[PDB]
């Protein structure tokens, strides 16, 4: 139902189609990648656990580097 | 000059031909994919060198790295750092006050370069907008909190960047 | 004659532009710019900083051409210290100078186009700007104020794979310029807005201290990269475009061609880039590596001195100028033997250019004033300091 | 047309009373003139066939409080015809007006206004000599060595008067001077 | 009927009051023939002040070369009573 | 129009002083409307203020110092008229509209 | 260390910097003939439609 | 022999009778310089290069060869210099700056501190032979 008022979330749902789940963090945020080349091969995004009241600061440090393409290690590999 | 070349420009002017190409090339990107990032679900790329929110670090034992040398305070081009120090009860040379005015700071990274023990660093965080001026007067406890929160990413960037500095 | 007060408090025209125009109907008789709205006392502040602490101030003068002013300040300090810069640093400095020139021309050409009603090119160009800003961030960690070019070389070496990414940008950028040209060059509205507007003769350009595109538009072959070359510019091939009419339309074409020639230099710099050190090795102004500072007593002492007191510059004075994107950018540096500059006078090309608005806009229409300001490529950070 | 030729040619052809000092160096050829000859010397350099110094790059002041003539006015000039640069300097104090060269180089107009604003040096025959950089009603010349870095006054909005007002400065943290000498 | 000049006696009076009210002018030496410098103890800066005080009271600007031939009360009254711009 | 040469002697300088006094004082009605001082101060009180500033420098004998003072006076005047910064009880530098002085200062602070 | 970012063996591929031409567009006479013929035939059609409407 | 279409310099018009104009200007200059004292270095210098340029203009009737031999820009640029030199001569007569004062003192500094190769440096190259001929004539 959140897709109707929140068009930002709808864009993620459409682009989630066919993506690979990479991991889930301690807050429940889900991390997806496509492995294509559309914006120069950058296809990493996060589906926040809270469908409302989501915030960019909710991404933990172990997944922050992966999300911003600073590192290729996922949050799971950094925690290990 | 010549009736053909006179006719050539007269028709080109009347029929607005050069404005046809302008329309044609404006339409080609219409059906092409867009470059817009779906913030905040998607983010722009950054490097391990990115100069963002400051953080104070500790050793893996929990001891502070900072030894109150005041090199970062001396080099800071904006005079954004204020430090007080004295000998700790166990004899250690430690700060009792470490303040960074995030509103004076110019995010140059000179403090990180000056520090001899890798205590002060500019982390990867750039999303820390506040509703009050006061919250941007970072004290020692806030900076050590930032280091605790971002330690795993900071240590990874430091390992990657160690081969260059 | 009535007086039309025009201050756009928004970056439609520079944000702090303030013009008092005397008009006869819609025809301008006198244009008087009021400046100092961004006067920040940079030259006074520099006197209270060490030579290292003063470097970030030069990023914020012409904030569209950051690394170019970094380069001029470093060259002036190197001139007074007689400091040898290694060859790899020279190529890197030239490479990012040309990247900065494209970044500048892309903003100057499309903000000008946006002001005369062409809204699409700005979006197409700022996307190319984002790719180039990414190269700034990968070498320095900052999108704009890199503080990457320093006396004696550059702060750090290039990250692995950056050169390949730069090469990928060069393989497609010519098409991006071609698209910008097709939207503007042949269009009859664009020509009608620019042709025979703001005509500057060669004598007028010399009289008013014009430089850069403002001087070469008037047919004067003058480019400091060839007249007084620096770094590795004498080992590179590039042509110097010159105008034949001295109007806003010529200077538009020159900036397009300068972007093409800048692409030419970057490609040569990428292929000729030699290996080696990127800092000068005189242990007087170059910071030691993190590993030696933590292992050698002499390196730790040098690191302590460089970040507290800085280096001293023997008492002397000189003027150093480079070919910045907006024209000749100069620094008159006076040293008194100490670790802080005694006097640092900044010569901004936009200071001379905006002073020429009065004679350039004489007897034009009100809507041509913005076009002439756009062809001058004014940034008030350097005008006001 | 290197710096050796200009130094040697100028000594032979210039009137002797115009130059007090001549320096040849890799930091730039430099003629030190008296105040009353500055205008004529610059006119000679601009018009003469063998110099053709057509471009006035900038004019700047330097403060030397230990000198009886504290101010030094530096003229940086360029000859595109011969691809050479020349520096001409002169001294001044807080009350000696000096000649304006706007009639020789129109670009001098704003630079002379800046010298007056920043240092307090006045220019005879300047068409429109007023402050150009500082706020309106500014007191003092900030580039003087004795002028404090943060100045004397600051501004803020005052709700009871419904306007921005100027008051004497009050810093939360004063500027810390670090003496590394 | 419309007039184009202030009455002489009315001017004599307005000028007499202006000169007296100016401080350093005791209302004892102020005669219609009294001279500013020689007989009133007013120096050059005080003397120029009186003349422009006549400009404010009568609302018109006196050309300087006339402001100088006004060294006394006759010369000032002779001038204002014949100047049309006086109101 | 242009900045004149330095006055040769004290007659020239004092002549320039009177032109400045005339020009500055003639602009009082413009200043009165700009700062709305009709119910605040009389025109004569501001005239006497300018005269007082001139008299306080009557001891200067160097004509070059007098020339600089007049030039700064014209600039102060121009900024007051052209770009007014209206406070309430001041214009520019000038306020508009049983114990000795030691105890008052002593009660205030230790810095005199 | 001993590995620095730089060119590959042989250098990068050549890149173009000069403007590329493009010959797209009809001719003065072609578009003139089209307009003239459309005008003539269409006005004849207007006459026919006016006759049927009447 | 072909007429020049453009000088390529904005605001610099083509002068088709350039040789004639130069001859007139140089002849005028050589006559007005005599009001300057003979011993003055400015008088000797002006006479030295004006005479040589006048000689080249008289010998060569083709403006392309006048530019080639003289090596100083176009003839239109040469004319500007000749006009400026005439203007400067008149101003020096008015100024009367000649003669050395009684207590004349001049300080010459020759600072030999080097600068790095990579910093900006003007290197114009060799002048035409006549410039060095004027200089050694002045010294002797
Ligand atoms: C609205 C306000 C805007 C304008 C601001 C005003 C700023 C004023 C400050 C600058 C003006 C000066 O002080 S200018 C300095 C004026 N002082 C002198 O001229 C020195 C020589 N003294 C004399 O000539 C006489 O003592 C004298 C009594 C003056 C007359 O002469 P008499 O003895 O024969 O009457
Ligand atoms: S980033 Fe720069 S300005 Fe900010 S605290 Fe560090 S040294 Fe100071
Ligand atoms: S953060 Fe580093 S440089 Fe700053 S006082 Fe602590 S140890 Fe010294």
Tab-separated table of N, CA, C and O in Angstrom, chain G residues 2-38:
chain	number	residue	atom	x	y	z
G	2	UNK	N	55.981	-0.528	-5.388
G	2	UNK	CA	56.599	-0.411	-6.701
G	2	UNK	C	55.580	-0.347	-7.830
G	2	UNK	O	55.969	-0.142	-8.985
G	3	UNK	N	54.297	-0.518	-7.529
G	3	UNK	CA	53.234	-0.473	-8.523
G	3	UNK	C	52.538	0.881	-8.437
G	3	UNK	O	52.025	1.251	-7.375
G	4	UNK	N	52.528	1.619	-9.546
G	4	UNK	CA	51.903	2.932	-9.608
G	4	UNK	C	50.888	2.976	-10.739
G	4	UNK	O	51.030	2.288	-11.754
G	5	UNK	N	49.858	3.798	-10.553
G	5	UNK	CA	48.818	3.939	-11.563
G	5	UNK	C	49.358	4.690	-12.772
G	5	UNK	O	49.894	5.795	-12.643
G	6	UNK	N	49.210	4.093	-13.951
G	6	UNK	CA	49.713	4.684	-15.167
G	6	UNK	C	49.178	4.021	-16.419
G	6	UNK	O	48.189	3.281	-16.391
G	7	UNK	N	49.829	4.283	-17.549
G	7	UNK	CA	49.356	3.754	-18.831
G	7	UNK	C	49.580	2.257	-18.918
G	7	UNK	O	50.460	1.712	-18.235
G	8	UNK	N	48.812	1.558	-19.748
G	8	UNK	CA	49.115	0.156	-20.035
G	8	UNK	C	50.251	0.056	-21.035
G	8	UNK	O	50.591	1.050	-21.693
G	9	UNK	N	50.877	-1.114	-21.164
G	9	UNK	CA	51.891	-1.296	-22.216
G	9	UNK	C	51.312	-0.981	-23.586
G	9	UNK	O	50.317	-1.573	-24.013
G	10	UNK	N	51.946	-0.033	-24.275
G	10	UNK	CA	51.451	0.468	-25.537
G	10	UNK	C	50.590	1.710	-25.438
G	10	UNK	O	50.335	2.350	-26.467
G	11	UNK	N	50.143	2.078	-24.239
G	11	UNK	CA	49.291	3.237	-24.071
G	11	UNK	C	47.834	2.923	-24.345
G	11	UNK	O	47.463	1.838	-24.793
G	12	UNK	N	46.987	3.907	-24.064
G	12	UNK	CA	45.560	3.766	-24.303
G	12	UNK	C	45.242	3.968	-25.781
G	12	UNK	O	46.062	4.457	-26.560
G	13	UNK	N	44.026	3.582	-26.157
G	13	UNK	CA	43.597	3.709	-27.540
G	13	UNK	C	43.450	5.183	-27.916
G	13	UNK	O	43.123	6.020	-27.069
G	14	UNK	N	43.700	5.530	-29.179
G	14	UNK	CA	43.530	6.922	-29.608
G	14	UNK	C	42.096	7.394	-29.429
G	14	UNK	O	41.137	6.642	-29.622
G	15	UNK	N	41.957	8.660	-29.051
G	15	UNK	CA	40.660	9.285	-28.843
G	15	UNK	C	40.547	10.470	-29.788
G	15	UNK	O	41.535	11.158	-30.064
G	16	UNK	N	39.348	10.675	-30.317
G	16	UNK	CA	39.086	11.824	-31.164
G	16	UNK	C	38.774	13.039	-30.301
G	16	UNK	O	38.144	12.925	-29.247
G	17	UNK	N	39.264	14.200	-30.729
G	17	UNK	CA	38.904	15.464	-30.110
G	17	UNK	C	38.268	16.450	-31.074
G	17	UNK	O	37.633	17.406	-30.617
G	18	UNK	N	38.409	16.247	-32.379
G	18	UNK	CA	37.858	17.159	-33.368
G	18	UNK	C	36.367	16.920	-33.565
G	18	UNK	O	35.870	15.801	-33.418
G	19	UNK	N	35.661	17.994	-33.907
G	19	UNK	CA	34.230	17.915	-34.172
G	19	UNK	C	33.931	17.002	-35.353
G	19	UNK	O	34.632	17.012	-36.367
G	20	UNK	N	32.869	16.216	-35.214
G	20	UNK	CA	32.435	15.281	-36.239
G	20	UNK	C	31.280	15.874	-37.036
G	20	UNK	O	30.332	16.421	-36.465
G	21	UNK	N	31.376	15.771	-38.361
G	21	UNK	CA	30.359	16.322	-39.247
G	21	UNK	C	29.137	15.407	-39.280
G	21	UNK	O	29.169	14.260	-38.824
G	22	UNK	N	28.041	15.927	-39.833
G	22	UNK	CA	26.784	15.182	-39.905
G	22	UNK	C	25.933	15.776	-41.019
G	22	UNK	O	25.482	16.920	-40.911
G	23	UNK	N	25.717	15.007	-42.086
G	23	UNK	CA	24.956	15.482	-43.242
G	23	UNK	C	23.556	14.869	-43.223
G	23	UNK	O	23.255	13.908	-43.933
G	24	UNK	N	22.682	15.461	-42.412
G	24	UNK	CA	21.278	15.077	-42.342
G	24	UNK	C	20.426	16.260	-42.777
G	24	UNK	O	20.586	17.369	-42.256
G	25	UNK	N	19.485	16.042	-43.703
G	25	UNK	CA	18.565	17.138	-44.073
G	25	UNK	C	18.146	17.112	-45.533
G	25	UNK	O	18.974	16.730	-46.384
G	26	UNK	N	16.896	17.508	-45.866
G	26	UNK	CA	16.434	17.560	-47.257
G	26	UNK	C	16.967	18.794	-48.004
G	26	UNK	O	17.817	19.486	-47.478
G	27	UNK	N	16.440	19.062	-49.200
G	27	UNK	CA	17.024	20.153	-50.019
G	27	UNK	C	16.052	21.307	-50.208
G	27	UNK	O	14.831	21.065	-50.193
G	28	UNK	N	16.593	22.513	-50.376
G	28	UNK	CA	15.767	23.708	-50.632
G	28	UNK	C	14.651	23.383	-51.624
G	28	UNK	O	13.477	23.639	-51.293
G	29	UNK	N	15.002	22.807	-52.770
G	29	UNK	CA	13.991	22.568	-53.831
G	29	UNK	C	13.015	21.462	-53.414
G	29	UNK	O	11.819	21.631	-53.671
G	30	UNK	N	13.496	20.384	-52.787
G	30	UNK	CA	12.589	19.263	-52.447
G	30	UNK	C	11.460	19.770	-51.555
G	30	UNK	O	10.299	19.420	-51.832
G	31	UNK	N	11.793	20.541	-50.520
G	31	UNK	CA	10.761	20.961	-49.548
G	31	UNK	C	9.882	22.029	-50.199
G	31	UNK	O	8.690	22.043	-49.900
G	32	UNK	N	10.444	22.852	-51.083
G	32	UNK	CA	9.645	23.870	-51.814
G	32	UNK	C	8.614	23.158	-52.688
G	32	UNK	O	7.439	23.524	-52.608
G	33	UNK	N	9.044	22.179	-53.483
G	33	UNK	CA	8.137	21.461	-54.416
G	33	UNK	C	7.037	20.780	-53.610
G	33	UNK	O	5.871	20.836	-54.032
G	34	UNK	N	7.408	20.176	-52.483
G	34	UNK	CA	6.421	19.518	-51.633
G	34	UNK	C	5.352	20.502	-51.177
G	34	UNK	O	4.152	20.228	-51.288
G	35	UNK	N	5.773	21.668	-50.682
G	35	UNK	CA	4.828	22.669	-50.200
G	35	UNK	C	3.963	23.190	-51.341
G	35	UNK	O	2.742	23.315	-51.198
G	36	UNK	N	4.571	23.494	-52.492
G	36	UNK	CA	3.800	24.017	-53.618
G	36	UNK	C	2.776	23.003	-54.118
G	36	UNK	O	1.615	23.355	-54.368
G	37	UNK	N	3.186	21.742	-54.276
G	37	UNK	CA	2.260	20.727	-54.745
G	37	UNK	C	1.161	20.437	-53.744
G	37	UNK	O	-0.004	20.268	-54.121
G	38	UNK	N	1.515	20.370	-52.457
G	38	UNK	CA	0.505	20.202	-51.423
G	38	UNK	C	-0.488	21.350	-51.451
G	38	UNK	O	-1.695	21.130	-51.356
